[PDB]
Each structure stands twice: as structure tokens, then as C-alpha cells.
UniProtKB/Swiss-Prot annotation:
Taxonomic lineage from the root: Eukaryota, Metazoa, Chordata, Craniata, Vertebrata
Superkingdom of origin organism: Eukaryota
Biological-process GO terms, alphabetical: cellular response to lipopolysaccharide; cytokine-mediated signaling pathway; immune response; inflammatory response
Protein name: Interleukin-1 family member 10
Molecular function via GO: cytokine activity; interleukin-1 receptor binding
Self-association and partners: Interacts with cargo receptor TMED10; the interaction mediates the translocation from the cytoplasm into the ERGIC (endoplasmic reticulum-Golgi intermediate compartment) and thereby secretion.
Length: 151
């Protein structure tokens, strides 16, 4: 049976900060200062969700763990889960929780939660704070990421 070919990136935030992982969290900063390397992050399209946008899954560690929304009474947050990116690619409605709409903002990219329209991936404001979701209308530096494709 055919296999998809995931795209890979190094993903940066403002001021050359990079996405990386430690202790089960997706973090942003200088990976080496936190005893890590910049994470090779992969994506695959969610083909069945909305063919008019660019829905994707976001995975770390060769796509072994993927970013998901989790609903709380204070709104959605994000966490990495033990679900691999091929399991999402071949899945169904349960994959919507792991889906983000990828769009351009000039030379940057923004990622909107498919499960929570209007909520976007947001960089941390505190050291060692995981990536956040924020409800942003007017695009800003807080939601702008830089995808540098490697595969």
C-alpha cells in the first residue's frame, strides 16, 4: 500500500528562536541552552477536512508524537500526544483535534486550530512555557512562525 511523504522543517519564531522538545512539551527558544537540538518537525495534509484551506498535522520525533488541542473550561490548550502522524493521515474525524490550518502572513506562517476556529499557535511569553493558543484577530508577531523546509 502507498505511503505518504511527510514534509520536514525547522520551525523558528521571532528573533531566531526555534521549536524544540523536552520532557514531553513543545517549547520555543534556544534549544542548545536547554540541552536540546532544534526539532525536525514534520507535517502531512489532512486531505478530507477542507480542500479550500491547508489543513495539516504537526509531528515531532519522526512523526511519532503529534500536536493536539485539548478543551478546557478556560478554552483550548495544546499538548503533544502519543499518536503518530501516519495514524492521523489514515484516520477520520478524531484527527480534527490534531489539525491546524496553515496560512501565510507575508513571509511567516500562522497555524489555526481546526477544532477551535479563531485560535492560533502562539509563542511563549515565559521561559520554558509550552507553545500556546491565542484568539487573535489582527495578525501579530506572537502568532508568526517561520518554516524552513528540509524535506
Amino acid at each position: 500500500s502507498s505511503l505518504p511523504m511527510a514534509r520536514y522543517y525547522i520551525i523558528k519564531y521571532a528573533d531566531q528562536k526555534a521549536l524544540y522538545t523536552r520532557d514531553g512539551q513543545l517549547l520555543v527558544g534556544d534549544p542548545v541552552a536547554d540541552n536540546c537540538c532544534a526539532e525536525k518537525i514534520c507535517t502531512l495534509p489532512n486531505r478530507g477536512l477542507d480542500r479550500t484551506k491547508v489543513p495539516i498535522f504537526l509531528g515531532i520525533q519522526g512523526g511519532s508524537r503529534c500536536l493536539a488541542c485539548v478543551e478546557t473550561e478556560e478554552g483550548p490548550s495544546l499538548q503533544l500526544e502519543d499518536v503518530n502522524i501516519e495514524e492521523l493521515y489514515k484516520g477520520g474525524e478524531e484527527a480534527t483535534r490534531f489539525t491546524f490550518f496553515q496560512s501565510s502572513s507575508g513571509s511567516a506562517f500562522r497555524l489555526e486550530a481546526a477544532a477551535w476556529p479563531g485560535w492560533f499557535l502562539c509563542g511563549p511569553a515565559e521561559p520554558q512555557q509550552p507553545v500556546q493558543l491565542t484568539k487573535e484577530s489582527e495578525p501579530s508577531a506572537r502568532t508568526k512562525f517561520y518554516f524552513e523546509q528540509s524535506w
